[PDB]
Amino acid sequence: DLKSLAKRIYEAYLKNFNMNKVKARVILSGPPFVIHDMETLCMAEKTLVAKLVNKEAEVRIFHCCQCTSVETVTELTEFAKAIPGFANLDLNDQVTLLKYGVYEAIFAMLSSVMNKDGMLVAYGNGFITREFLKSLRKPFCDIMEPKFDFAMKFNALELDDSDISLFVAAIICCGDRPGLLNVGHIEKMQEGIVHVLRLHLQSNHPDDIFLFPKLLQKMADLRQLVTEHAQLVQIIKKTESDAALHPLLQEIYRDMY
Amino acid sequence: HKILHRLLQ
Ligand SMILES: CSc1ccc(C(=O)/C=C/c2cc(C)c(OC(C)(C)C(=O)O)c(C)c2)cc1
């Protein structure tokens, strides 16, 4: 019953996200083209985003990041639509939950394609190194390093996709978002998902008896990561003309934090 | 939020 809510959420995760942790680990275990310097970035661009190539490399990369985000937002909207109870909410609350939750979910899921040396990109066909991203000019070199720091500690929890699907549902189904209309119903929806997450972790991770409170803390850490990311994005938009922001992403950030 | 609202429709 609750086991079935957990399975339905996991099934919806496997169906709606192009990348999952099993798929990513297969690729990361050895084929992705390695982007480790300007030469290989330019090569990967010609093979994997050929239409895109011509501002500075950093602005081209930032454009690619946005395309990745827009795609993941669409996947999250479908996944959410598949979360039992979500589609019965007021359409305006559905928008609010997704507006505040998508980047928390994005950076949680990004951990699955990250290791200490770099991350998968372009639908698993590239691997960009962490040191290359640090090498970009300011402010672009400041984007990803806090996400790697989050991911190394998140990955140390050794969650699998059955855990992560419930965690992403719990992020989305969050009753304390600003502007909610039916807070009471959302809190009950959230309580039900968190209940299923709590029991699932007890079953799937009997070795780690604090895993549930650890994940509650990661949820709070993600909120802060998102606030800080949104601040950097605002600095980039105001100080870099070549770095326009996609309209869906402007809509999400607008009046967020 | 017209894109989200349409994405959800
Ligand atoms: C082919 S090169 C390449 C491809 C993909 C990636 C990548 O994974 C992106 C991570 C990433 C990067 C950035 C700037 C990012 O913030 C943007 C897009 C403005 C936002 O939506 O707020 C997010 C949310 C995620 C890096 C390089």
Q: Is the dihedral of CA A93, A95, A100, A105 positive or negative?
A: positive
Amino acid letter for position A65: C
Interface touch A77/B2, C-beta < 8 Å: no
Q: Which residue of B lies nearest to A253 if distances are taken between CA atoms?
A: B1
Contact (CB<8Å) B8/A99: no
Q: Do B4 and A74 touch (CB under 8 A)?
A: no
Q: For residue A102, what are the contacts with CB-CB under 8 A and spacing of at least 6?
A: A72, A73, A76, A252
Give me the DSSP letters along B1-9: -HHHHHHH-
Closest CA to A12 of A219, A173, A166, A215: A166
Going by their DSSP bridges, the two strands A114-115 and A118-121 should be labelled as: antiparallel
Instruction: Give the domain extent around A98.
Output: 1-257
- Number of domains chain A is built from: 1
Does the annotation place A135 within a ligand binding site?
no
- Residue A119 φ then ψ, to 5°: -145, 150
CA distance A251 to chain B (A): 6
- E strand intervals along chain A: 33-35, 114-115, 118-121, 126-129
Which residues, 6+ apart, have CB-to-CB distance to A202 below 8 Å? A212
Q: How far apart are CA A126 and CA A143, in angstroms?
A: 19
| A238, two tokens | 């105001």
> Cα(A118)–Cα(A247) distance, rounded to whole angstroms?
28
